[PDB]
């Protein structure tokens, strides 16, 4: 029984709604196998290392994302930035949960709404394969039509300039999602696993085993296991891979720091990082393989090419997995199972992301610790109100903007600043001593080198290319207006600037000379007596040569 509990905990932690919803369309958008190379490389060299770093930071300091920067006070803007990023991401994560809930409610029938045309939401162009412009998305399949017109009601929106009013069915589903979130978070800290640690893998295995047998699935498997190396010479695949690594692993959100701050101090964060990263890699490879088998099946059913058969946006799984369920026997049972799985995964991830904000901000302000019901209500209600934009008629455009900018360059920059503040200013040797205190072994050279040089360097590379090789935002054949790009960059900068803003604020608020202020800002808050003694390690070269 205890072994089963450990297995469930580790595999449930490894699996995120990102792995099952977001990875498929970044994988499809970037050709598949070509996406898996930068993704695996980034996992190894920055994601597992920084996942480990965040776990150890939270578990050693017993703090959330913001207050963990008592070890280097100048870097608390980083914690504030990751909290803001987590809030932004919750503004559209719960809308994907609301889509899952809508699809589950729609799954309680013997005639699934996405199998045929002839519904009230179907356009005259709906083409039922059972009874095309090359560089264009199909959009006329029964599943694509169900999603876009009967779920999103996107046909009633011309663009992000005309998003319309919140669709009321999605409004009720979002209300249910956020009420469940509140009452799952209001009386205690986030830290069901017989659903969120077993159903994702059973569903993934069923999809893989069934899809490999679908007609045309071989073509999708060949497209997936085909590396288009020309894609690897552009920055899009690398940026997408780095962002997906940090999105699925939970770094750059304060989620890992807050989660670990509630762990036992002697818990093995190294084994946790290894298990989570290995399972993330395996469930991403298998998730891509299954979604590309389905895509190769739809390219054969719809007689369209794989690169044009489905969306490259957020709702790709809400077309692909309904398409796979339709081919399964007892498709209603499988629809319910899949959308219960999606709802559970999303609710778990959203509770973790909300606890990131709640813990990070209640650790910083202790008045908030005495009011968890009220502060949790504030967070959930704000998230609901600002997610109301992504359940409008043109809410897919708002969701695309957010899924591009809330945690993109901003999340990469936040994890880069975390890595720098921990491994250069606090000291990677000091951090290794902390990890030895927790676990009894000191981190190896691979981890310290990654923390100090490799993960920071690759993160800086992706951050720079994300800015200089930025591509204007589009949703399928829809090109967002330029002001939408400026708004998205404003959303990214809103968290990115908290770092320098907090550095300036901390410098100006501190008293003393310039060097006294610098020493107080780089020394841990519990060692500030050393500043008066002129005993700052960061003012010596041996500190910065440390590895």
């Amino acid at each position: 029984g205890k072994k089963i509990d450990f297995l469930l905990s580790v595999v449930g932690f490894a699996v995120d709604l990102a792995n099952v919803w977001r990875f498929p369309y970044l994988c499809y958008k970037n050709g598949g196998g070509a996406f898996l190379i930068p993704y695996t490389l980034f996992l190894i060299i920055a994601g597992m290392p920084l996942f480990y770093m965040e776990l150890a930071l939270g578990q050693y300091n017993r703090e959330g994302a913001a207050t963990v920067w008592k070890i280097c006070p100048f870097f608390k803007g980083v914690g504030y930035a990751v909290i803001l990023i987590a809030l932004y991401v919750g503004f559209y994560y719960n809308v994907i949960i609301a889509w899952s809930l809508y699809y589950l409610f729609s799954s309680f029938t013997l005639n699934l709404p996405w199998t045929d045309c002839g519904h009230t939401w179907n356009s005259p162009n709906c083409t039922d394969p059972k009874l095309h412009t090359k560089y264009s998305k199909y959009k006329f399949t029964p599943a694509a039509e169900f999603y876009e017109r009967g779920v999103l009601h996107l046909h009633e929106s011309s663009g992000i300039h005309d998003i319309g009013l919140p669709q009321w069915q999605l409004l009720l589903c979002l209300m249910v999602v956020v009420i469940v979130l509140y009452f799952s978070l209001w009386k205690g800290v986030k830290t069901v696993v017989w659903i969120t640690a077993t159903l994702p893998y059973f569903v993934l295995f069923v999809l893989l085993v069934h899809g490999v047998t679908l007609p045309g699935a071989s073509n999708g498997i060949n497209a997936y296991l085909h590396i288009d190396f020309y894609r690897l010479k552009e920055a899009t695949v690398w940026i997408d891979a780095a962002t997906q690594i940090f999105f699925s692993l939970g770094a750059g959100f304060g989620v890992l720091i807050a989660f670990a701050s509630y762990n036992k101090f002697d818990n093995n964060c190294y084994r946790d990082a290894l298990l989570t990263s290995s399972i993330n890699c395996i469930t991403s490879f298998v998730s891509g393989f299954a979604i590309f088998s389905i895509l190769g099946y739809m390219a054969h059913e719809h007689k369209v090419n794989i690169e044009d058969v489905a969306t490259e946006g957020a709702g790709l799984v809400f077309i692909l997995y309904p398409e796979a369920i339709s081919t399964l026997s007892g498709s209603t049972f499988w629809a319910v199972v899949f959308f219960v799985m999606l709802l559970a995964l999303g609710l778990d991830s959203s509770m973790g992301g909300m606890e990131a904000v709640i813990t990070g901000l209640a650790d910083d302000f202790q008045v908030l610790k005495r009011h968890r019901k009220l502060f949790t209500f504030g967070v959930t209600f704000s998230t609901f109100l600002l997610a109301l934009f992504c359940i409008t008629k043109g809410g897919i455009y708002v969701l695309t903007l957010l899924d591009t900018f809330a945690a993109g360059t901003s999340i990469l920059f936040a994890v880069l600043m975390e890595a720098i503040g921990v491994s250069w200013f606090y000291g990677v040797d000091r951090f290794s001593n902390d990890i030895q205190q927790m676990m009894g072994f000191r981190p190896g050279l691979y981890w310290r080198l990654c923390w100090k040089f490799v993960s920071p360097a690759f993160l800086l590379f992706v951050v720079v290319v994300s800015i200089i090789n930025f591509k204007p935002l589009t949703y399928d054949d829809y090109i967002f207006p330029p002001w939408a790009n400026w708004v998205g960059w404003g959303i990214a900068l809103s968290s990115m600037v908290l770092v320098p803003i907090y550095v300036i604020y901390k410098f100006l608020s501190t008293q003393g000379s310039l060097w006294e202020r610098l020493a107080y800002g780089i020394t841990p808050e519990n060692e500030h007596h050393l500043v008066a003694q002129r005993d700052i390690r960061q003012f010596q070269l041996q500190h910065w040569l440390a590895i």
Epitope: R62, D266, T359, A362, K369, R370, R372
Partner: nanobody, 119 residues
Framework: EVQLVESGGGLVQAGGSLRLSCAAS????????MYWYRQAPGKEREWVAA???????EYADSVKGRFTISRDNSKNTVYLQMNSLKPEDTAVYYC??????????????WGQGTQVTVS
């Protein structure tokens, strides 16, 4: 792993001074809340002093202005400098560790206790 070993107790004349030590192990006293309790003979456990992860110290009204709680993060030791010891201060002084904050409630380790007797 979490081990608290109190020391520094013993006989002391009324109005004297004693410094208790709590050699903590298995955790950093800097990131955890450290408490001092005392169980007088025939009474219940009375909370005496608390130093929090931030270094903020709280004292019971019965010891305010007399007992001082401090910690040595380098030594991972918590001290209780007890001054002007009244005969009523005789008790077994226990050192307690709690996790940082009210939402972290999985640490409540105690020491064996150090006996303080004021004659």
């Amino acid at each position: 792993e979490v081990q608290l070993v109190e020391s520094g107790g013993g006989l002391v004349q009324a109005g004297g001074s004693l410094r208790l030590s709590c050699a903590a192990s298995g955790f950093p006293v800097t990131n955890f809340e450290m408490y001092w309790y005392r169980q007088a003979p025939g009474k219940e456990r009375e909370w005496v002093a608390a130093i929090y992860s931030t270094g903020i110290t709280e004292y019971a009204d019965s010891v305010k202005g007399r007992f001082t709680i401090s910690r040595d993060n380098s030594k991972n030791t918590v001290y209780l400098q007890m001054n002007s010891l009244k005969p009523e201060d005789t008790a077994v002084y226990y050192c307690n560790v709690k996790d940082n904050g009210a939402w972290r409630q999985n640490y409540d380790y105690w020491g064996q206790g150090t006996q303080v007797t004021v004659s």
